[PDB]
Ligand binder design. Structure first.
Ligand SMILES: CC(C)Cc1cc(-n2c3c(c4c2CC(C)(C)CC4=O)CCN(C)C3)cc2c1C(=O)NCC2
Length: 209
């Protein structure tokens, strides 16, 4: 069973702005997704200090960057807290509403797309480079889920039939035809060094065979 949901009006408006605005500094999507993963790692690490059993699903706290030229995909894997079904459908979207409204007002007031993170809606910068985004996630208190959106005002949520993850999130970016530079090893290295050099977790860039 695949459930289809409409995005909150403000979120749909933000996604349209990200996809339709002429903005060359697209590389910022990577630091935004790395920031989301770093926050998820911080959350599980903190919670594990009071309840160590929260790490039974995996002790390693890291981020993996996996480019795939054949599939034209860039995958960001983290062993963070993961997201529940309620987080994917309601919680994060509700939280993002105020930030989205504030960001769009700031953009009208003279701010630029790179400031997206200051409003806590950085996840949506994935649409600067991806035509479709697939989010595979597993939280300790829930089943493994697959969230997906090609924008256009809707998203889908289904129980993931694929390989079990243990705990964490996989963000699969199905890249736009003219955005293949983000699959090159030296380009990814340059972006990580420039914007995410002080992330407190190991960032491993997987090289293609
Ligand atoms: C910020 C952490 C705790 C959770 C998280 C949240 C999100 N995220 C966020 C937002 C959204 C998402 C992912 C989606 C698919 C639920 C969409 C969304 O609105 C809005 C607010 N941001 C602060 C975070 C994305 C990821 C993750 C994650 O665990 N790993 C990398 C991908």
């Amino acid at each position: 069973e695949v459930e289809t949901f409409a995005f909150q009006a403000e979120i749909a408006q933000l996604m349209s702005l990200i996809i339709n605005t002429f903005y060359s500094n697209k590389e910022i999507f990577l630091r935004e997704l790395i920031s989301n993963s770093s926050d998820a790692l911080d959350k599980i690490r903190y919670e594990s200090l009071t309840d160590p059993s929260k790490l039974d699903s995996g002790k390693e706290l890291h981020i993996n960057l996996i480019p795939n030229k054949q599939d034209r995909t860039l995958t960001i894997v983290d062993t963070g807290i993961g997201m529940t079904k309620a987080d994917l459908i309601n919680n994060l979207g509700t939280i993002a509403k105020s930030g989205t409204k504030a960001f769009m007002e700031a953009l009208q007031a003279g701010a630029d797309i790179s400031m997206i993170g200051q409003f806590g809606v950085g996840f949506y910068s994935a649409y600067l480079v991806a035509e479709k985004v697939t989010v595979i996630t597993k939280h300790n208190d829930d089943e493994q889920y697959a969230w997906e959106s090609s924008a256009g005002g809707s998203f889908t949520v289904r129980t993931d039939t694929g390989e079990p993850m243990g705990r964490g999130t996989k963000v699969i970016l199905h890249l736009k035809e003219d955005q293949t530079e983000y699959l090159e090893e030296r380009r990814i290295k340059e972006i990580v060094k420039k914007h995410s050099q002080f992330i407190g977790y190991p960032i491993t860039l997987f090289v293609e065979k």
